[PDB]
Amino acid sequence: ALKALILNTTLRRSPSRSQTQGLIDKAVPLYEKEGIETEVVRVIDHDIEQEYWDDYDDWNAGEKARREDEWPWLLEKIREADILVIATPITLNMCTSAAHVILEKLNLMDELNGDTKQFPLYNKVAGLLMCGNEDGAHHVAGTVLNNLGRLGYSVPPNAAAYWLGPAGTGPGYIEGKGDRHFHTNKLIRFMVANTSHLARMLQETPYTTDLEACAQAAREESDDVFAIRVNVNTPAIRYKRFQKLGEVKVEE
Amino acid sequence: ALKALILNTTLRRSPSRSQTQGLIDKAVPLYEKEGIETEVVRVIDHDIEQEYWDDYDDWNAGEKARREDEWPWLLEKIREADILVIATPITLNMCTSAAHVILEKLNLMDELNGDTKQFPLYNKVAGLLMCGNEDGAHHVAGTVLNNLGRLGYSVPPNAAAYWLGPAGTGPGYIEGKGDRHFHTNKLIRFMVANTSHLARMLQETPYTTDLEACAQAAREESDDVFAIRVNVNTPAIRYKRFQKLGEVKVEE
Amino acid sequence: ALKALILNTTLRRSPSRSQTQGLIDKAVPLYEKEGIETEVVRVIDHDIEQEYWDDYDDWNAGEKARREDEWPWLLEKIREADILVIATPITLNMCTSAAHVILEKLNLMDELNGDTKQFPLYNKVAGLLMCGNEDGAHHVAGTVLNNLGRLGYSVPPNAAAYWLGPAGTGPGYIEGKGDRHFHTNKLIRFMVANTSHLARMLQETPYTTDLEACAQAAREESDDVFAIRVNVNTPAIRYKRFQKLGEVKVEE
Amino acid sequence: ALKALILNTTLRRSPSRSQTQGLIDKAVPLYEKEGIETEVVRVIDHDIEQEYWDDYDDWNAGEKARREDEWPWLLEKIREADILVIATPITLNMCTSAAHVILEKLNLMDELNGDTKQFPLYNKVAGLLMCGNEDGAHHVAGTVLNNLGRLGYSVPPNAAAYWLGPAGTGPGYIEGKGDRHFHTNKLIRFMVANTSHLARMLQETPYTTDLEACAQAAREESDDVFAIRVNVNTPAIRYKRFQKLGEVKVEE
Ligand SMILES: Cc1cc2nc3c(=O)[nH]c(=O)[nH]c3[n+](CC(=O)[C@@H](O)[C@@H](O)COP(=O)(O)O)c2cc1N
Ligand SMILES: Cc1cc2nc3c(=O)[nH]c(=O)[nH]c3[n+](CC(=O)[C@@H](O)[C@@H](O)COP(=O)(O)O)c2cc1N
Ligand SMILES: Cc1cc2nc3c(=O)[nH]c(=O)[nH]c3[n+](CC(=O)[C@@H](O)[C@@H](O)COP(=O)(O)O)c2cc1N
Ligand SMILES: Cc1cc2nc3c(=O)[nH]c(=O)[nH]c3[n+](CC(=O)[C@@H](O)[C@@H](O)COP(=O)(O)O)c2cc1N
């Protein structure tokens, strides 16, 4: 069967009560009625290393970045899930820092599958559940769904469901009675119905795009050097699409 | 046959040379090789009224807003196109004001159909071409594609292609030789292949979601009043998800 | 004698009731108690041409762009005001298209003050009023206030005041009783008090920065060509800060 | 003697070479030439706990969030610094998750200066250094500087300096020769000059705003309950500022 993986990216460790979890609790039985098996992971409960290392970095400095953690376990669940729902509180008009770490680490998956010539997360479907006290839902949805789009996820219409109160400091979903908020409840239902349909579609008729071939055709029509002259004689920062400075020619 | 409509939202009237049109000129033959009938509209060439009126406004003040313009023609083309590609320059880290006016008027389309019980632009596909001198493509992509998804568009992976120069004032795509810019050329090819595929899928197996039925289910599990107490005794704007202010008792 | 100019960027013509105008009506008497002269302009009531032309465009295509409108009148007012307050409704998680046009045209300035070597809007102060039915205030503040900062405006703390209802379709400020909304009313008071203080400060102690001399220091430490090699052999879009492609050597 | 604190929020531990540190290395001598004592902290080098606990959470599970870490050490520096410069690489069109955590924890302060009745970070100045491979500088600047403004920071004009390559995957500042990039080098000079000036101003003539008095005046003109009726009989998500549903009357 198809699988939906819902990542609660709250910053409070289980079992502390999460506002965002209220939206998850509505979505789970709806996915199960669709025949889509659900799993909820609260990512902050798990040891996921934030630090970065590759071979350009200092070798000893990277020991902590290279340590054994729980990321392979979580990455494998994401690879296996046909639907990825990020369920995030809003902080600083963004997703939480926990969602941010996960997405940073996930952005290793724009390289290739040997037989599809597609990124590893191609043919999957993304949805979004968000909870804020007042503001930021559409901004976060734009940022997060755009990034997932870059990785291979398809986004159906009305794929982001959320709760917000009025302009103010709070309170959140629980005291604000968001479990009976009509607009949120109808958005959650839209999102589940549409992500489920698109997931079944992509299971039957995946993209056949060969990104390697697209890239080769693009190589055969492009240069391998970008170069432009800069006007260094002005403090101005106003935009000029035509600057008439002269084109550049490259050494040998 | 499938139709793709590409809206160049440059602020300069034809035949003035448009940087963004360079990306369009790459995309059109690629769609035509996909078997998809393409049409390019430069919306600024057409008389589209920006002012708003509805029957809550003053009747005389709204006369200019109600005047006969070319919006019904353009709206009918959007309704007919299976793929909508917004092709916009970046201004102020946003789409152009012309794209903005078009999207404002298009967001009247969030009500139902017959028959399908879906918004009128359901089962369509969105992609994005963008051109800026230096910065803003992913921010604009998040904003524009999120809004199109609210209307019923589905978004495939890698649906946004763009050109940008380095940090600076420009110049633009033409002087910058973007027509031979590898990254842009490959993204344009990704976008055309993926949008064409998703359009063919949705032609054959559209969403069957009944938004009316989703809304009726939400109504049964929801209140028809939102009400919270407010802490009027503090200058603080720190978020507080629990405030223990007491419930609001509502009459009738 | 300081002047504050408040631009209501609603899309509905006077005298139609504007939701955003409710916040302006709170702010005006507060500024006047500060001893600051205030003027409110509803910009949609004035003829401001959106289209663009310069010498690189087609002459005949640009005739409409070059026509007589009310922009010189409005631009002179912005230039003269010590405090600019954009008072914008939210559309599509952005300011309105009317605000978008004004800012597009305001960004077309290409001057440097001969005596101070600064942009024309240096030493002015920016505040923000916003009104939306549910969502978008901090995103719009980020975008608009970042753009004004690039032009020369300084931004005090708590410079953006706004009203929003809960997640939903509305209603707006008037039916939602925003005029008695504590959070909005206290933010408006913070905004007026802080912008007023900062405006007075800059009137006594303006920036003495010499933008021309900064740019000349930068010219001495910088190249006049930007050039990089591009990896044209991969479909990957993964970010690689080091790519081992070789330096490009330019011939001048 | 003013203090400037520069937080490098790279995800790579010292002494691994950071692209963003290149911009920092330009700014530090410019600040010291202004007579400002400058400290650089690479926050990822320090053990700062990401998890959240307060007394509404689960005591037992909150033990890790409550643990002794290095946050008080870093917060003291932020409390003392007259200028805070966030120096962040761009990930996912945002600041890094490391910057995200720091700002999250900074936003948890709940204090009012007993004498000035201002938030604790009032009268400070914020600036920004950013480094990305291609895109996101103005979006990050909007988000980060809007958040610091809510905390009490003032933002001068041209307070955000950055480097970006063209559309693509990289490379970054070092291989792209950003240390000799004219646009970046001049923006760094603008930013140091303007933040230094504004910090000196605010040390002389701080804001005298009484936030508590402002909130008390807002309390007198406002309701202590927010309540609106909802239309539960539509699937539409079209925005409607006027819905004629009727007022909510609240008991007692
Ligand atoms: C540091 C910080 C920043 C915030 N930025 C925003 C914002 O910018 N906008 C908003 O509307 N709300 C914001 N909130 C409230 C919020 O979202 C959470 O409390 C709630 O949702 C809890 O969910 P959870 O119980 O599942 O963890 C923030 C709270 C923070 N601690
Ligand atoms: C007022 C204003 C603002 C801008 N804001 C940004 C921005 O924030 N970022 C960027 O990278 N570029 C920006 N540009 C350059 C740009 O985009 C166009 O010139 C080009 O693309 C034209 O394309 P076209 O020939 O098809 O019209 C702006 C230019 C403006 N006139
Ligand atoms: C097309 C369109 C899009 C919108 N996008 C958003 C959004 O993204 N978020 C929101 O919260 N609200 C939004 N609204 C409501 C809104 O803002 C205005 O009606 C109000 O403010 C009127 O103010 P006024 O009477 O002074 O003109 C939109 C309304 C639109 N017509
Ligand atoms: C996961 C991920 C995401 C990214 N998202 C973006 C983006 O959205 N836009 C951009 O322009 N660049 C991006 N980069 C490159 C970047 O910024 C850094 O490598 C550089 O700056 C290193 O700086 P440092 O050596 O001081 O750490 C990303 C890189 C990542 N590892």
PDB file of N, CA, C and O in Angstrom, chain D residues 114-169:
ATOM      1  N   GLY D 114      12.900  47.728  33.782  1.00  0.00           N
ATOM      2  CA  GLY D 114      12.108  48.382  34.811  1.00  0.00           C
ATOM      3  C   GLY D 114      12.178  49.897  34.761  1.00  0.00           C
ATOM      4  O   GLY D 114      11.251  50.578  35.203  1.00  0.00           O
ATOM      5  N   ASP D 115      13.262  50.446  34.214  1.00  0.00           N
ATOM      6  CA  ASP D 115      13.429  51.895  34.196  1.00  0.00           C
ATOM      7  C   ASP D 115      12.897  52.528  32.914  1.00  0.00           C
ATOM      8  O   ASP D 115      12.173  53.526  32.972  1.00  0.00           O
ATOM      9  N   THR D 116      13.255  51.970  31.756  1.00  0.00           N
ATOM     10  CA  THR D 116      12.820  52.521  30.477  1.00  0.00           C
ATOM     11  C   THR D 116      11.509  51.936  29.972  1.00  0.00           C
ATOM     12  O   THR D 116      10.906  52.515  29.058  1.00  0.00           O
ATOM     13  N   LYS D 117      11.059  50.810  30.526  1.00  0.00           N
ATOM     14  CA  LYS D 117       9.847  50.139  30.050  1.00  0.00           C
ATOM     15  C   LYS D 117       9.976  49.794  28.567  1.00  0.00           C
ATOM     16  O   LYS D 117       9.060  50.024  27.769  1.00  0.00           O
ATOM     17  N   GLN D 118      11.139  49.265  28.196  1.00  0.00           N
ATOM     18  CA  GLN D 118      11.418  48.824  26.839  1.00  0.00           C
ATOM     19  C   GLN D 118      11.883  47.379  26.885  1.00  0.00           C
ATOM     20  O   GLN D 118      12.327  46.891  27.925  1.00  0.00           O
ATOM     21  N   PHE D 119      11.752  46.688  25.753  1.00  0.00           N
ATOM     22  CA  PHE D 119      12.308  45.349  25.626  1.00  0.00           C
ATOM     23  C   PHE D 119      13.822  45.415  25.818  1.00  0.00           C
ATOM     24  O   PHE D 119      14.431  46.462  25.589  1.00  0.00           O
ATOM     25  N   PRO D 120      14.459  44.318  26.246  1.00  0.00           N
ATOM     26  CA  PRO D 120      15.883  44.411  26.615  1.00  0.00           C
ATOM     27  C   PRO D 120      16.813  44.736  25.459  1.00  0.00           C
ATOM     28  O   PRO D 120      17.885  45.311  25.701  1.00  0.00           O
ATOM     29  N   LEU D 121      16.456  44.419  24.213  1.00  0.00           N
ATOM     30  CA  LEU D 121      17.358  44.703  23.103  1.00  0.00           C
ATOM     31  C   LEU D 121      17.067  46.048  22.428  1.00  0.00           C
ATOM     32  O   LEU D 121      17.621  46.328  21.357  1.00  0.00           O
ATOM     33  N   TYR D 122      16.239  46.888  23.048  1.00  0.00           N
ATOM     34  CA  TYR D 122      15.993  48.231  22.542  1.00  0.00           C
ATOM     35  C   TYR D 122      17.285  49.045  22.500  1.00  0.00           C
ATOM     36  O   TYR D 122      18.194  48.853  23.313  1.00  0.00           O
ATOM     37  N   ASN D 123      17.350  49.955  21.529  1.00  0.00           N
ATOM     38  CA  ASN D 123      18.439  50.901  21.303  1.00  0.00           C
ATOM     39  C   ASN D 123      19.684  50.255  20.718  1.00  0.00           C
ATOM     40  O   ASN D 123      20.746  50.899  20.678  1.00  0.00           O
ATOM     41  N   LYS D 124      19.589  49.013  20.251  1.00  0.00           N
ATOM     42  CA  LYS D 124      20.671  48.352  19.535  1.00  0.00           C
ATOM     43  C   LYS D 124      20.448  48.480  18.027  1.00  0.00           C
ATOM     44  O   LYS D 124      19.391  48.907  17.563  1.00  0.00           O
ATOM     45  N   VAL D 125      21.473  48.114  17.263  1.00  0.00           N
ATOM     46  CA  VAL D 125      21.487  48.251  15.811  1.00  0.00           C
ATOM     47  C   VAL D 125      21.819  46.897  15.208  1.00  0.00           C
ATOM     48  O   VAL D 125      22.698  46.184  15.706  1.00  0.00           O
ATOM     49  N   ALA D 126      21.109  46.537  14.145  1.00  0.00           N
ATOM     50  CA  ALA D 126      21.299  45.249  13.494  1.00  0.00           C
ATOM     51  C   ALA D 126      21.827  45.451  12.085  1.00  0.00           C
ATOM     52  O   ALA D 126      21.431  46.385  11.382  1.00  0.00           O
ATOM     53  N   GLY D 127      22.729  44.574  11.679  1.00  0.00           N
ATOM     54  CA  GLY D 127      23.155  44.505  10.300  1.00  0.00           C
ATOM     55  C   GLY D 127      23.254  43.052   9.897  1.00  0.00           C
ATOM     56  O   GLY D 127      23.106  42.154  10.721  1.00  0.00           O
ATOM     57  N   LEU D 128      23.551  42.838   8.628  1.00  0.00           N
ATOM     58  CA  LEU D 128      23.451  41.502   8.079  1.00  0.00           C
ATOM     59  C   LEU D 128      24.539  41.302   7.036  1.00  0.00           C
ATOM     60  O   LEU D 128      24.800  42.192   6.223  1.00  0.00           O
ATOM     61  N   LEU D 129      25.196  40.147   7.100  1.00  0.00           N
ATOM     62  CA  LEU D 129      26.100  39.662   6.071  1.00  0.00           C
ATOM     63  C   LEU D 129      25.548  38.324   5.612  1.00  0.00           C
ATOM     64  O   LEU D 129      25.220  37.478   6.449  1.00  0.00           O
ATOM     65  N   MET D 130      25.418  38.132   4.307  1.00  0.00           N
ATOM     66  CA  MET D 130      24.926  36.857   3.796  1.00  0.00           C
ATOM     67  C   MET D 130      25.791  36.341   2.656  1.00  0.00           C
ATOM     68  O   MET D 130      26.358  37.108   1.878  1.00  0.00           O
ATOM     69  N   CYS D 131      25.828  35.019   2.523  1.00  0.00           N
ATOM     70  CA  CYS D 131      26.569  34.376   1.450  1.00  0.00           C
ATOM     71  C   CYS D 131      25.749  33.208   0.928  1.00  0.00           C
ATOM     72  O   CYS D 131      25.417  32.301   1.694  1.00  0.00           O
ATOM     73  N   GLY D 132      25.397  33.233  -0.366  1.00  0.00           N
ATOM     74  CA  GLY D 132      24.807  32.083  -1.010  1.00  0.00           C
ATOM     75  C   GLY D 132      25.501  31.782  -2.327  1.00  0.00           C
ATOM     76  O   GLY D 132      26.211  32.622  -2.881  1.00  0.00           O
ATOM     77  N   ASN D 133      25.259  30.573  -2.842  1.00  0.00           N
ATOM     78  CA  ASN D 133      25.804  30.244  -4.157  1.00  0.00           C
ATOM     79  C   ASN D 133      25.060  30.971  -5.275  1.00  0.00           C
ATOM     80  O   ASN D 133      25.673  31.296  -6.302  1.00  0.00           O
ATOM     81  N   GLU D 134      23.760  31.262  -5.103  1.00  0.00           N
ATOM     82  CA  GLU D 134      23.033  31.855  -6.228  1.00  0.00           C
ATOM     83  C   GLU D 134      21.888  32.805  -5.874  1.00  0.00           C
ATOM     84  O   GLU D 134      21.623  33.742  -6.639  1.00  0.00           O
ATOM     85  N   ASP D 135      21.205  32.616  -4.743  1.00  0.00           N
ATOM     86  CA  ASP D 135      19.887  33.230  -4.654  1.00  0.00           C
ATOM     87  C   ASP D 135      19.378  33.203  -3.219  1.00  0.00           C
ATOM     88  O   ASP D 135      19.542  32.200  -2.527  1.00  0.00           O
ATOM     89  N   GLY D 136      18.759  34.309  -2.783  1.00  0.00           N
ATOM     90  CA  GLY D 136      18.023  34.314  -1.520  1.00  0.00           C
ATOM     91  C   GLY D 136      18.351  35.461  -0.582  1.00  0.00           C
ATOM     92  O   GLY D 136      17.776  35.566   0.508  1.00  0.00           O
ATOM     93  N   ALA D 137      19.275  36.329  -0.987  1.00  0.00           N
ATOM     94  CA  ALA D 137      19.785  37.346  -0.072  1.00  0.00           C
ATOM     95  C   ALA D 137      18.678  38.281   0.400  1.00  0.00           C
ATOM     96  O   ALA D 137      18.533  38.536   1.601  1.00  0.00           O
ATOM     97  N   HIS D 138      17.887  38.824  -0.529  1.00  0.00           N
ATOM     98  CA  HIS D 138      16.899  39.807  -0.103  1.00  0.00           C
ATOM     99  C   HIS D 138      15.766  39.157   0.680  1.00  0.00           C
ATOM    100  O   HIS D 138      15.215  39.768   1.600  1.00  0.00           O
ATOM    101  N   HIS D 139      15.421  37.916   0.344  1.00  0.00           N
ATOM    102  CA  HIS D 139      14.408  37.205   1.111  1.00  0.00           C
ATOM    103  C   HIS D 139      14.867  36.981   2.547  1.00  0.00           C
ATOM    104  O   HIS D 139      14.110  37.231   3.496  1.00  0.00           O
ATOM    105  N   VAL D 140      16.106  36.496   2.724  1.00  0.00           N
ATOM    106  CA  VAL D 140      16.655  36.291   4.068  1.00  0.00           C
ATOM    107  C   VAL D 140      16.743  37.617   4.813  1.00  0.00           C
ATOM    108  O   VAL D 140      16.405  37.711   6.003  1.00  0.00           O
ATOM    109  N   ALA D 141      17.200  38.666   4.129  1.00  0.00           N
ATOM    110  CA  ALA D 141      17.303  39.970   4.773  1.00  0.00           C
ATOM    111  C   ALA D 141      15.945  40.437   5.288  1.00  0.00           C
ATOM    112  O   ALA D 141      15.818  40.866   6.439  1.00  0.00           O
ATOM    113  N   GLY D 142      14.905  40.302   4.471  1.00  0.00           N
ATOM    114  CA  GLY D 142      13.576  40.678   4.931  1.00  0.00           C
ATOM    115  C   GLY D 142      13.173  39.908   6.173  1.00  0.00           C
ATOM    116  O   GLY D 142      12.724  40.494   7.161  1.00  0.00           O
ATOM    117  N   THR D 143      13.350  38.579   6.147  1.00  0.00           N
ATOM    118  CA  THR D 143      12.898  37.754   7.265  1.00  0.00           C
ATOM    119  C   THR D 143      13.705  38.034   8.525  1.00  0.00           C
ATOM    120  O   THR D 143      13.141  38.177   9.616  1.00  0.00           O
ATOM    121  N   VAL D 144      15.036  38.084   8.406  1.00  0.00           N
ATOM    122  CA  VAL D 144      15.850  38.192   9.612  1.00  0.00           C
ATOM    123  C   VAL D 144      15.748  39.594  10.213  1.00  0.00           C
ATOM    124  O   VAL D 144      15.572  39.754  11.432  1.00  0.00           O
ATOM    125  N   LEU D 145      15.831  40.630   9.377  1.00  0.00           N
ATOM    126  CA  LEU D 145      15.791  41.989   9.919  1.00  0.00           C
ATOM    127  C   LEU D 145      14.397  42.367  10.413  1.00  0.00           C
ATOM    128  O   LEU D 145      14.275  43.133  11.381  1.00  0.00           O
ATOM    129  N   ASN D 146      13.337  41.820   9.814  1.00  0.00           N
ATOM    130  CA  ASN D 146      12.011  42.051  10.378  1.00  0.00           C
ATOM    131  C   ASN D 146      11.921  41.465  11.779  1.00  0.00           C
ATOM    132  O   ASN D 146      11.369  42.092  12.688  1.00  0.00           O
ATOM    133  N   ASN D 147      12.490  40.273  11.979  1.00  0.00           N
ATOM    134  CA  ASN D 147      12.435  39.647  13.292  1.00  0.00           C
ATOM    135  C   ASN D 147      13.251  40.419  14.322  1.00  0.00           C
ATOM    136  O   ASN D 147      12.825  40.559  15.474  1.00  0.00           O
ATOM    137  N   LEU D 148      14.443  40.888  13.943  1.00  0.00           N
ATOM    138  CA  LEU D 148      15.254  41.649  14.890  1.00  0.00           C
ATOM    139  C   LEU D 148      14.606  42.989  15.219  1.00  0.00           C
ATOM    140  O   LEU D 148      14.730  43.466  16.347  1.00  0.00           O
ATOM    141  N   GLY D 149      13.892  43.592  14.262  1.00  0.00           N
ATOM    142  CA  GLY D 149      13.148  44.805  14.556  1.00  0.00           C
ATOM    143  C   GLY D 149      12.074  44.588  15.604  1.00  0.00           C
ATOM    144  O   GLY D 149      11.806  45.468  16.429  1.00  0.00           O
ATOM    145  N   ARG D 150      11.439  43.416  15.592  1.00  0.00           N
ATOM    146  CA  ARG D 150      10.407  43.160  16.595  1.00  0.00           C
ATOM    147  C   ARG D 150      10.998  43.118  17.999  1.00  0.00           C
ATOM    148  O   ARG D 150      10.296  43.411  18.978  1.00  0.00           O
ATOM    149  N   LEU D 151      12.285  42.760  18.106  1.00  0.00           N
ATOM    150  CA  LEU D 151      12.979  42.616  19.382  1.00  0.00           C
ATOM    151  C   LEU D 151      13.525  43.923  19.929  1.00  0.00           C
ATOM    152  O   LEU D 151      13.883  43.968  21.113  1.00  0.00           O
ATOM    153  N   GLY D 152      13.638  44.963  19.106  1.00  0.00           N
ATOM    154  CA  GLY D 152      14.181  46.222  19.594  1.00  0.00           C
ATOM    155  C   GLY D 152      15.315  46.802  18.775  1.00  0.00           C
ATOM    156  O   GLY D 152      15.755  47.928  19.042  1.00  0.00           O
ATOM    157  N   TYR D 153      15.802  46.053  17.780  1.00  0.00           N
ATOM    158  CA  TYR D 153      16.872  46.538  16.914  1.00  0.00           C
ATOM    159  C   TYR D 153      16.352  47.556  15.907  1.00  0.00           C
ATOM    160  O   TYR D 153      15.259  47.404  15.347  1.00  0.00           O
ATOM    161  N   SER D 154      17.147  48.607  15.697  1.00  0.00           N
ATOM    162  CA  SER D 154      16.979  49.543  14.601  1.00  0.00           C
ATOM    163  C   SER D 154      17.848  49.095  13.437  1.00  0.00           C
ATOM    164  O   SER D 154      18.908  48.484  13.629  1.00  0.00           O
ATOM    165  N   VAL D 155      17.394  49.397  12.225  1.00  0.00           N
ATOM    166  CA  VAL D 155      18.052  48.968  11.001  1.00  0.00           C
ATOM    167  C   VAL D 155      18.351  50.213  10.173  1.00  0.00           C
ATOM    168  O   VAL D 155      17.428  50.918   9.759  1.00  0.00           O
ATOM    169  N   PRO D 156      19.611  50.538   9.923  1.00  0.00           N
ATOM    170  CA  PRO D 156      19.928  51.672   9.058  1.00  0.00           C
ATOM    171  C   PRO D 156      19.683  51.312   7.605  1.00  0.00           C
ATOM    172  O   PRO D 156      19.422  50.139   7.287  1.00  0.00           O
ATOM    173  N   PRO D 157      19.764  52.280   6.687  1.00  0.00           N
ATOM    174  CA  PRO D 157      19.722  51.940   5.260  1.00  0.00           C
ATOM    175  C   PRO D 157      20.920  51.099   4.845  1.00  0.00           C
ATOM    176  O   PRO D 157      22.005  51.193   5.426  1.00  0.00           O
ATOM    177  N   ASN D 158      20.713  50.275   3.819  1.00  0.00           N
ATOM    178  CA  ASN D 158      21.777  49.448   3.249  1.00  0.00           C
ATOM    179  C   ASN D 158      22.498  48.664   4.345  1.00  0.00           C
ATOM    180  O   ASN D 158      23.727  48.654   4.436  1.00  0.00           O
ATOM    181  N   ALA D 159      21.711  48.039   5.214  1.00  0.00           N
ATOM    182  CA  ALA D 159      22.240  47.295   6.352  1.00  0.00           C
ATOM    183  C   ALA D 159      22.560  45.845   6.028  1.00  0.00           C
ATOM    184  O   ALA D 159      23.070  45.136   6.902  1.00  0.00           O
ATOM    185  N   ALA D 160      22.271  45.385   4.810  1.00  0.00           N
ATOM    186  CA  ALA D 160      22.447  43.987   4.429  1.00  0.00           C
ATOM    187  C   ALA D 160      23.428  43.899   3.269  1.00  0.00           C
ATOM    188  O   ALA D 160      23.165  44.427   2.182  1.00  0.00           O
ATOM    189  N   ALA D 161      24.548  43.231   3.501  1.00  0.00           N
ATOM    190  CA  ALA D 161      25.594  43.059   2.503  1.00  0.00           C
ATOM    191  C   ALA D 161      25.721  41.575   2.203  1.00  0.00           C
ATOM    192  O   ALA D 161      25.613  40.743   3.107  1.00  0.00           O
ATOM    193  N   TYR D 162      25.961  41.233   0.943  1.00  0.00           N
ATOM    194  CA  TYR D 162      25.896  39.826   0.572  1.00  0.00           C
ATOM    195  C   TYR D 162      26.720  39.565  -0.675  1.00  0.00           C
ATOM    196  O   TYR D 162      27.069  40.479  -1.428  1.00  0.00           O
ATOM    197  N   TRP D 163      26.984  38.284  -0.896  1.00  0.00           N
ATOM    198  CA  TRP D 163      27.555  37.773  -2.124  1.00  0.00           C
ATOM    199  C   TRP D 163      26.681  36.643  -2.637  1.00  0.00           C
ATOM    200  O   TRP D 163      26.181  35.827  -1.855  1.00  0.00           O
ATOM    201  N   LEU D 164      26.500  36.604  -3.956  1.00  0.00           N
ATOM    202  CA  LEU D 164      25.810  35.531  -4.648  1.00  0.00           C
ATOM    203  C   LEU D 164      26.471  35.349  -6.005  1.00  0.00           C
ATOM    204  O   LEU D 164      26.819  36.335  -6.653  1.00  0.00           O
ATOM    205  N   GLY D 165      26.616  34.100  -6.438  1.00  0.00           N
ATOM    206  CA  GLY D 165      26.944  33.829  -7.821  1.00  0.00           C
ATOM    207  C   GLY D 165      25.712  33.923  -8.699  1.00  0.00           C
ATOM    208  O   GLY D 165      24.617  34.284  -8.255  1.00  0.00           O
ATOM    209  N   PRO D 166      25.876  33.598  -9.978  1.00  0.00           N
ATOM    210  CA  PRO D 166      24.719  33.545 -10.876  1.00  0.00           C
ATOM    211  C   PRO D 166      23.893  32.292 -10.620  1.00  0.00           C
ATOM    212  O   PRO D 166      24.295  31.384  -9.890  1.00  0.00           O
ATOM    213  N   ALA D 167      22.718  32.258 -11.246  1.00  0.00           N
ATOM    214  CA  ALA D 167      21.855  31.081 -11.215  1.00  0.00           C
ATOM    215  C   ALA D 167      22.655  29.807 -11.451  1.00  0.00           C
ATOM    216  O   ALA D 167      23.400  29.696 -12.438  1.00  0.00           O
ATOM    217  N   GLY D 168      22.567  28.872 -10.518  1.00  0.00           N
ATOM    218  CA  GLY D 168      23.371  27.678 -10.619  1.00  0.00           C
ATOM    219  C   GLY D 168      23.613  27.061  -9.256  1.00  0.00           C
ATOM    220  O   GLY D 168      22.928  27.378  -8.285  1.00  0.00           O
ATOM    221  N   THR D 169      24.610  26.180  -9.220  1.00  0.00           N
ATOM    222  CA  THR D 169      24.889  25.366  -8.042  1.00  0.00           C
ATOM    223  C   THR D 169      26.082  25.870  -7.244  1.00  0.00           C
ATOM    224  O   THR D 169      26.325  25.379  -6.132  1.00  0.00           O
TER     225      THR D 169
END
